[PDB]
Design a protein around this nucleic acid. Structure first.
Length: 49
RNA sequence: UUUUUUUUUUUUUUUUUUUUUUUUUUUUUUUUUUUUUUUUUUUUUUUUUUUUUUUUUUUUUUUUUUUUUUUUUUUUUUUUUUUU
């Protein structure tokens, strides 16, 4: 549907609001899991994976 | 969050050549001449029964062992702090 000025501002703010308070998990995903490093498969990370 | 750039400027008709000139009948050879019946051998002559052996004599029950003896709850950690 069409978005008014208030709704557009609210959605733009919610862009920042999303995934708040969970920086540890998403940082773990993005950095440790993605960006595949030869040090990942090291037999002390399999349970964490 | 965002901070640049993002019209155009040339060329682009044509000019040659492009009929033909030779040759292109024929001339040999092309019947036949030998040989072509037959003459040996071609029955048979040994051997060809048989002569051993062929029952049996051992052994053949059994003698062990065969319950059990431990251990077997628990004692950590486990929200969040950036940017966008």
């Amino acid at each position: 549907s069409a978005k008014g000025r208030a709704v557009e501002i609210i959605s733009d703010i919610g862009n920042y609001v999303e995934e708040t308070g969970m920086a540890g998990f998403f940082a773990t995903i993005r950095f440790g899991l993605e960006t595949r490093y030869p040090a990942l498969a090291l037999n002390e990370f399999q349970s964490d994976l």
